[PDB]
Short mmCIF file of N, CA, C and O in Angstrom, two decimals:
data_model
loop_
_atom_site.label_atom_id
_atom_site.label_comp_id
_atom_site.label_asym_id
_atom_site.label_seq_id
_atom_site.Cartn_x
_atom_site.Cartn_y
_atom_site.Cartn_z
N UNK A 1 -26.54 46.20 12.21
CA UNK A 1 -26.41 47.29 11.25
C UNK A 1 -26.23 46.80 9.83
O UNK A 1 -26.73 47.43 8.89
N UNK A 2 -25.52 45.70 9.65
CA UNK A 2 -25.16 45.20 8.33
C UNK A 2 -26.37 44.48 7.74
O UNK A 2 -26.83 43.47 8.28
N UNK A 3 -26.89 45.02 6.64
CA UNK A 3 -28.12 44.49 6.06
C UNK A 3 -27.83 43.34 5.09
O UNK A 3 -26.68 43.07 4.71
N UNK A 4 -28.91 42.70 4.65
CA UNK A 4 -28.91 41.44 3.92
C UNK A 4 -28.03 41.44 2.69
O UNK A 4 -27.46 40.40 2.33
N UNK A 5 -27.91 42.59 2.03
CA UNK A 5 -27.03 42.71 0.88
C UNK A 5 -25.61 42.32 1.24
O UNK A 5 -25.06 41.34 0.73
N UNK A 6 -25.01 43.08 2.14
CA UNK A 6 -23.63 42.82 2.49
C UNK A 6 -23.50 41.65 3.45
O UNK A 6 -22.39 41.13 3.59
N UNK A 7 -24.58 41.22 4.09
CA UNK A 7 -24.56 39.90 4.70
C UNK A 7 -24.34 38.84 3.65
O UNK A 7 -23.64 37.84 3.89
N UNK A 8 -24.90 39.03 2.46
CA UNK A 8 -24.66 38.09 1.39
C UNK A 8 -23.26 38.25 0.83
O UNK A 8 -22.68 37.29 0.32
N UNK A 9 -22.70 39.46 0.90
CA UNK A 9 -21.31 39.60 0.51
C UNK A 9 -20.39 38.87 1.48
O UNK A 9 -19.47 38.15 1.05
N UNK A 10 -20.62 39.05 2.78
CA UNK A 10 -19.91 38.26 3.77
C UNK A 10 -20.07 36.78 3.45
O UNK A 10 -19.11 36.02 3.49
N UNK A 11 -21.30 36.37 3.12
CA UNK A 11 -21.56 34.98 2.82
C UNK A 11 -20.75 34.52 1.61
O UNK A 11 -20.34 33.36 1.54
N UNK A 12 -20.56 35.41 0.64
CA UNK A 12 -19.73 35.08 -0.50
C UNK A 12 -18.32 34.78 -0.04
O UNK A 12 -17.72 33.76 -0.43
N UNK A 13 -17.79 35.63 0.84
CA UNK A 13 -16.44 35.38 1.35
C UNK A 13 -16.39 34.11 2.18
O UNK A 13 -15.43 33.34 2.08
N UNK A 14 -17.40 33.87 3.01
CA UNK A 14 -17.37 32.71 3.88
C UNK A 14 -17.43 31.45 3.05
O UNK A 14 -16.53 30.62 3.09
N UNK A 15 -18.52 31.28 2.29
CA UNK A 15 -18.70 30.08 1.47
C UNK A 15 -17.53 29.87 0.53
O UNK A 15 -17.16 28.72 0.24
N UNK A 16 -16.93 30.96 0.06
CA UNK A 16 -15.66 30.87 -0.63
C UNK A 16 -14.62 30.17 0.24
O UNK A 16 -13.97 29.21 -0.19
N UNK A 17 -14.50 30.60 1.49
CA UNK A 17 -13.52 29.99 2.39
C UNK A 17 -13.90 28.57 2.76
O UNK A 17 -13.02 27.75 3.05
N UNK A 18 -15.19 28.27 2.77
CA UNK A 18 -15.65 26.90 2.96
C UNK A 18 -15.13 26.03 1.84
O UNK A 18 -14.61 24.94 2.08
N UNK A 19 -15.31 26.50 0.61
CA UNK A 19 -14.77 25.77 -0.52
C UNK A 19 -13.26 25.66 -0.43
O UNK A 19 -12.68 24.70 -0.95
N UNK A 20 -12.61 26.61 0.24
CA UNK A 20 -11.18 26.48 0.44
C UNK A 20 -10.85 25.38 1.43
O UNK A 20 -9.92 24.61 1.20
N UNK A 21 -11.59 25.29 2.54
CA UNK A 21 -11.28 24.25 3.51
C UNK A 21 -11.58 22.89 2.93
O UNK A 21 -10.84 21.92 3.13
N UNK A 22 -12.72 22.77 2.25
CA UNK A 22 -13.01 21.59 1.46
C UNK A 22 -11.85 21.30 0.52
O UNK A 22 -11.45 20.14 0.34
N UNK A 23 -11.25 22.35 -0.04
CA UNK A 23 -10.11 22.16 -0.91
C UNK A 23 -8.88 21.70 -0.16
O UNK A 23 -8.03 21.01 -0.72
N UNK A 24 -8.76 22.07 1.10
CA UNK A 24 -7.63 21.56 1.88
C UNK A 24 -7.85 20.09 2.16
O UNK A 24 -6.95 19.26 1.97
N UNK A 25 -9.05 19.75 2.60
CA UNK A 25 -9.36 18.37 2.94
C UNK A 25 -9.38 17.48 1.71
O UNK A 25 -9.32 16.25 1.86
N UNK A 26 -9.47 18.06 0.51
CA UNK A 26 -9.46 17.29 -0.72
C UNK A 26 -8.07 17.22 -1.35
O UNK A 26 -7.59 16.13 -1.66
N UNK A 27 -7.44 18.38 -1.54
CA UNK A 27 -6.15 18.44 -2.22
C UNK A 27 -5.08 17.65 -1.49
O UNK A 27 -4.14 17.14 -2.12
N UNK A 28 -5.19 17.53 -0.17
CA UNK A 28 -4.14 16.94 0.65
C UNK A 28 -4.12 15.44 0.39
O UNK A 28 -4.68 14.64 1.15
N UNK A 29 -3.47 15.07 -0.70
CA UNK A 29 -3.39 13.69 -1.17
C UNK A 29 -1.93 13.28 -1.21
O UNK A 29 -1.22 13.55 -2.18
N UNK A 30 -1.49 12.63 -0.15
CA UNK A 30 -0.12 12.16 -0.05
C UNK A 30 -0.01 10.81 -0.73
O UNK A 30 -0.67 9.85 -0.33
N UNK A 31 0.83 10.72 -1.76
CA UNK A 31 0.96 9.51 -2.55
C UNK A 31 -0.38 9.10 -3.14
O UNK A 31 -0.65 7.91 -3.35
N UNK A 32 -1.25 10.08 -3.40
CA UNK A 32 -2.59 9.84 -3.86
C UNK A 32 -3.57 9.55 -2.75
O UNK A 32 -4.77 9.40 -3.02
N UNK A 33 -3.11 9.48 -1.51
CA UNK A 33 -3.95 9.12 -0.37
C UNK A 33 -4.48 10.40 0.25
O UNK A 33 -3.73 11.15 0.87
N UNK A 34 -5.79 10.63 0.12
CA UNK A 34 -6.37 11.83 0.68
C UNK A 34 -6.34 11.73 2.19
O UNK A 34 -7.23 11.15 2.81
N UNK A 35 -5.28 12.30 2.77
CA UNK A 35 -5.08 12.24 4.21
C UNK A 35 -6.24 12.86 4.95
O UNK A 35 -6.85 12.22 5.82
N UNK A 36 -6.58 14.09 4.60
CA UNK A 36 -7.60 14.85 5.30
C UNK A 36 -9.00 14.53 4.82
O UNK A 36 -9.93 15.30 5.05
N UNK A 37 -9.16 13.39 4.17
CA UNK A 37 -10.48 12.83 4.00
C UNK A 37 -11.02 12.52 5.39
O UNK A 37 -10.57 11.59 6.05
N UNK A 38 -11.98 13.33 5.84
CA UNK A 38 -12.51 13.17 7.17
C UNK A 38 -13.39 11.96 7.37
O UNK A 38 -13.85 11.73 8.50
N UNK A 39 -13.63 11.18 6.32
CA UNK A 39 -14.38 9.94 6.38
C UNK A 39 -13.50 8.72 6.20
O UNK A 39 -13.97 7.59 6.38
N UNK A 40 -12.22 8.91 5.87
CA UNK A 40 -11.35 7.82 5.47
C UNK A 40 -10.90 7.00 6.67
O UNK A 40 -11.19 5.80 6.75
N UNK A 41 -10.20 7.63 7.60
CA UNK A 41 -9.89 7.00 8.87
C UNK A 41 -10.85 7.48 9.94
O UNK A 41 -10.46 8.24 10.81
N UNK A 42 -12.10 7.05 9.87
CA UNK A 42 -13.05 7.25 10.96
C UNK A 42 -13.20 5.91 11.67
O UNK A 42 -13.44 4.88 11.03
N UNK A 43 -13.04 5.94 12.99
CA UNK A 43 -13.35 4.80 13.84
C UNK A 43 -14.82 4.90 14.21
O UNK A 43 -15.19 5.38 15.28
N UNK A 44 -15.69 4.44 13.31
CA UNK A 44 -17.12 4.46 13.56
C UNK A 44 -17.46 3.32 14.52
O UNK A 44 -16.59 2.77 15.21
N UNK A 45 -18.75 3.00 14.61
CA UNK A 45 -19.21 1.85 15.37
C UNK A 45 -18.43 0.59 15.04
O UNK A 45 -18.08 -0.18 15.94
N UNK A 46 -18.13 0.37 13.75
CA UNK A 46 -17.27 -0.72 13.34
C UNK A 46 -15.84 -0.20 13.23
O UNK A 46 -15.61 0.74 12.45
N UNK A 47 -14.87 -0.73 13.97
CA UNK A 47 -13.50 -0.21 13.83
C UNK A 47 -12.90 -0.42 12.45
O UNK A 47 -12.07 0.39 12.02
N UNK A 48 -13.30 -1.47 11.74
CA UNK A 48 -12.73 -1.77 10.44
C UNK A 48 -12.94 -0.64 9.44
O UNK A 48 -12.17 -0.51 8.49
N UNK A 49 -13.97 0.19 9.65
CA UNK A 49 -14.19 1.31 8.74
C UNK A 49 -13.05 2.32 8.79
O UNK A 49 -12.80 2.99 7.79
N UNK A 50 -12.35 2.43 9.92
CA UNK A 50 -11.13 3.23 9.93
C UNK A 50 -10.10 2.50 9.09
O UNK A 50 -9.80 1.33 9.34
N UNK B 1 1.09 3.65 4.05
CA UNK B 1 1.18 4.73 3.07
C UNK B 1 1.33 4.21 1.65
O UNK B 1 0.80 4.83 0.72
N UNK B 2 2.04 3.11 1.47
CA UNK B 2 2.36 2.59 0.15
C UNK B 2 1.14 1.86 -0.39
O UNK B 2 0.71 0.85 0.18
N UNK B 3 0.59 2.37 -1.49
CA UNK B 3 -0.64 1.82 -2.03
C UNK B 3 -0.37 0.66 -2.99
O UNK B 3 0.77 0.39 -3.39
N UNK B 4 -1.46 0.01 -3.39
CA UNK B 4 -1.47 -1.27 -4.09
C UNK B 4 -0.62 -1.28 -5.35
O UNK B 4 -0.06 -2.33 -5.71
N UNK B 5 -0.53 -0.14 -6.02
CA UNK B 5 0.32 -0.04 -7.20
C UNK B 5 1.75 -0.41 -6.87
O UNK B 5 2.30 -1.40 -7.38
N UNK B 6 2.37 0.37 -6.00
CA UNK B 6 3.76 0.12 -5.68
C UNK B 6 3.93 -1.03 -4.71
O UNK B 6 5.04 -1.54 -4.58
N UNK B 7 2.86 -1.46 -4.04
CA UNK B 7 2.91 -2.77 -3.40
C UNK B 7 3.11 -3.85 -4.44
O UNK B 7 3.81 -4.83 -4.20
N UNK B 8 2.51 -3.67 -5.62
CA UNK B 8 2.73 -4.63 -6.68
C UNK B 8 4.11 -4.47 -7.27
O UNK B 8 4.68 -5.44 -7.78
N UNK B 9 4.67 -3.26 -7.24
CA UNK B 9 6.05 -3.12 -7.67
C UNK B 9 7.00 -3.83 -6.71
O UNK B 9 7.91 -4.54 -7.15
N UNK B 10 6.80 -3.63 -5.41
CA UNK B 10 7.54 -4.40 -4.42
C UNK B 10 7.38 -5.88 -4.72
O UNK B 10 8.34 -6.64 -4.69
N UNK B 11 6.15 -6.30 -5.00
CA UNK B 11 5.89 -7.70 -5.28
C UNK B 11 6.67 -8.17 -6.50
O UNK B 11 7.09 -9.33 -6.57
N UNK B 12 6.82 -7.30 -7.49
CA UNK B 12 7.63 -7.64 -8.64
C UNK B 12 9.05 -7.93 -8.22
O UNK B 12 9.64 -8.95 -8.60
N UNK B 13 9.60 -7.06 -7.37
CA UNK B 13 10.96 -7.29 -6.89
C UNK B 13 11.05 -8.55 -6.03
O UNK B 13 12.00 -9.32 -6.15
N UNK B 14 10.06 -8.78 -5.17
CA UNK B 14 10.12 -9.93 -4.29
C UNK B 14 10.04 -11.21 -5.10
O UNK B 14 10.95 -12.03 -5.07
N UNK B 15 8.94 -11.39 -5.83
CA UNK B 15 8.74 -12.60 -6.62
C UNK B 15 9.89 -12.83 -7.58
O UNK B 15 10.25 -13.97 -7.87
N UNK B 16 10.46 -11.74 -8.09
CA UNK B 16 11.72 -11.84 -8.81
C UNK B 16 12.78 -12.52 -7.95
O UNK B 16 13.43 -13.48 -8.38
N UNK B 17 12.94 -12.06 -6.71
CA UNK B 17 13.95 -12.64 -5.84
C UNK B 17 13.58 -14.07 -5.43
O UNK B 17 14.47 -14.88 -5.15
N UNK B 18 12.29 -14.37 -5.38
CA UNK B 18 11.85 -15.74 -5.15
C UNK B 18 12.34 -16.63 -6.27
O UNK B 18 12.88 -17.71 -6.03
N UNK B 19 12.13 -16.18 -7.50
CA UNK B 19 12.64 -16.92 -8.64
C UNK B 19 14.16 -17.03 -8.59
O UNK B 19 14.73 -17.99 -9.11
N UNK B 20 14.82 -16.06 -7.95
CA UNK B 20 16.26 -16.17 -7.78
C UNK B 20 16.62 -17.26 -6.78
O UNK B 20 17.54 -18.03 -7.02
N UNK B 21 15.91 -17.34 -5.66
CA UNK B 21 16.25 -18.36 -4.67
C UNK B 21 15.94 -19.73 -5.23
O UNK B 21 16.69 -20.69 -5.03
N UNK B 22 14.78 -19.86 -5.87
CA UNK B 22 14.49 -21.06 -6.63
C UNK B 22 15.62 -21.36 -7.60
O UNK B 22 16.02 -22.52 -7.77
N UNK B 23 16.19 -20.32 -8.20
CA UNK B 23 17.31 -20.51 -9.09
C UNK B 23 18.56 -20.96 -8.37
O UNK B 23 19.40 -21.65 -8.94
N UNK B 24 18.72 -20.57 -7.11
CA UNK B 24 19.87 -21.05 -6.35
C UNK B 24 19.67 -22.52 -6.04
O UNK B 24 20.56 -23.35 -6.24
N UNK B 25 18.48 -22.86 -5.56
CA UNK B 25 18.19 -24.23 -5.20
C UNK B 25 18.14 -25.15 -6.41
O UNK B 25 18.22 -26.37 -6.25
N UNK B 26 18.02 -24.59 -7.61
CA UNK B 26 18.00 -25.37 -8.83
C UNK B 26 19.37 -25.45 -9.49
O UNK B 26 19.86 -26.54 -9.81
N UNK B 27 20.00 -24.29 -9.72
CA UNK B 27 21.26 -24.24 -10.44
C UNK B 27 22.36 -25.00 -9.72
O UNK B 27 23.28 -25.52 -10.37
N UNK B 28 22.28 -25.10 -8.40
CA UNK B 28 23.36 -25.67 -7.60
C UNK B 28 23.38 -27.18 -7.83
O UNK B 28 22.85 -27.97 -7.05
N UNK B 29 24.01 -27.56 -8.93
CA UNK B 29 24.08 -28.95 -9.38
C UNK B 29 25.54 -29.35 -9.46
O UNK B 29 26.22 -29.09 -10.45
N UNK B 30 26.01 -29.98 -8.40
CA UNK B 30 27.39 -30.44 -8.32
C UNK B 30 27.49 -31.81 -8.98
O UNK B 30 26.84 -32.76 -8.55
N UNK B 31 28.30 -31.90 -10.03
CA UNK B 31 28.42 -33.13 -10.80
C UNK B 31 27.06 -33.56 -11.36
O UNK B 31 26.80 -34.75 -11.53
N UNK B 32 26.18 -32.58 -11.60
CA UNK B 32 24.83 -32.84 -12.02
C UNK B 32 23.88 -33.12 -10.89
O UNK B 32 22.68 -33.28 -11.13
N UNK B 33 24.37 -33.17 -9.65
CA UNK B 33 23.57 -33.51 -8.49
C UNK B 33 23.04 -32.22 -7.87
O UNK B 33 23.81 -31.45 -7.29
N UNK B 34 21.74 -32.01 -7.98
CA UNK B 34 21.15 -30.79 -7.43
C UNK B 34 21.23 -30.87 -5.91
O UNK B 34 20.36 -31.45 -5.26
N UNK B 35 22.30 -30.28 -5.37
CA UNK B 35 22.54 -30.32 -3.94
C UNK B 35 21.39 -29.69 -3.17
O UNK B 35 20.81 -30.32 -2.28
N UNK B 36 21.04 -28.47 -3.53
CA UNK B 36 20.03 -27.71 -2.82
C UNK B 36 18.62 -28.04 -3.26
O UNK B 36 17.69 -27.27 -3.02
N UNK B 37 18.45 -29.19 -3.89
CA UNK B 37 17.13 -29.77 -4.01
C UNK B 37 16.63 -30.05 -2.61
O UNK B 37 17.10 -30.97 -1.94
N UNK B 38 15.68 -29.24 -2.15
CA UNK B 38 15.18 -29.38 -0.80
C UNK B 38 14.32 -30.59 -0.55
O UNK B 38 13.89 -30.80 0.59
N UNK B 39 14.05 -31.39 -1.59
CA UNK B 39 13.31 -32.63 -1.48
C UNK B 39 14.20 -33.85 -1.67
O UNK B 39 13.74 -34.98 -1.46
N UNK B 40 15.46 -33.66 -2.03
CA UNK B 40 16.33 -34.76 -2.44
C UNK B 40 16.81 -35.55 -1.24
O UNK B 40 16.53 -36.75 -1.13
N UNK B 41 17.54 -34.90 -0.34
CA UNK B 41 17.88 -35.50 0.94
C UNK B 41 16.95 -35.01 2.02
O UNK B 41 17.36 -34.23 2.87
N UNK B 42 15.70 -35.45 1.99
CA UNK B 42 14.78 -35.24 3.11
C UNK B 42 14.66 -36.56 3.84
O UNK B 42 14.41 -37.61 3.23
N UNK B 43 14.85 -36.51 5.15
CA UNK B 43 14.57 -37.64 6.03
C UNK B 43 13.10 -37.54 6.44
O UNK B 43 12.76 -37.05 7.51
N UNK B 44 12.22 -38.02 5.57
CA UNK B 44 10.79 -38.01 5.86
C UNK B 44 10.49 -39.13 6.85
O UNK B 44 11.37 -39.66 7.52
N UNK B 45 9.20 -39.45 6.97
CA UNK B 45 8.77 -40.59 7.76
C UNK B 45 9.55 -41.86 7.43
O UNK B 45 9.93 -42.61 8.34
N UNK B 46 9.82 -42.10 6.15
CA UNK B 46 10.68 -43.19 5.73
C UNK B 46 12.09 -42.66 5.57
O UNK B 46 12.30 -41.74 4.77
N UNK B 47 13.09 -43.18 6.29
CA UNK B 47 14.45 -42.65 6.11
C UNK B 47 15.01 -42.88 4.72
O UNK B 47 15.83 -42.07 4.26
N UNK B 48 14.60 -43.95 4.04
CA UNK B 48 15.14 -44.26 2.72
C UNK B 48 14.89 -43.15 1.72
O UNK B 48 15.65 -43.04 0.74
N UNK B 49 13.87 -42.32 1.93
CA UNK B 49 13.62 -41.22 1.02
C UNK B 49 14.75 -40.21 1.02
O UNK B 49 14.97 -39.54 0.00
N UNK B 50 15.48 -40.07 2.12
CA UNK B 50 16.69 -39.26 2.09
C UNK B 50 17.71 -40.00 1.24
O UNK B 50 18.02 -41.17 1.50
#
C-alpha cells in the first residue's frame, strides 16, 4: 500500500538511523581508541590484523 | 588500552627512575669509594678484577 514517496520517507528515517549506528561505531572512542571500529580488532586470515 | 602517548609518559617516569637507580649506584660513595659500582668488585673470569 505504501507508495514510493513515503517509502522514500521511511528511507529517510532508516538511512538517518544508519548514520546513527555509524555514529555509534565511530563516536565510541575510549581514550581515543575507537572500540566499535568493526575493522580494528578483526581476526582476519592473518591474526596480527586483530 | 593505554596508547603510545601516555605509554611515553609512563616511560618518562620509568626512565626517570632508572636515572634514580643509576644515581643510587653512583652517589653511594663511602670515603669516596663507589660501593654500588656494579663493575668495581666483580669477580669476572680473572679474580683480580674484583
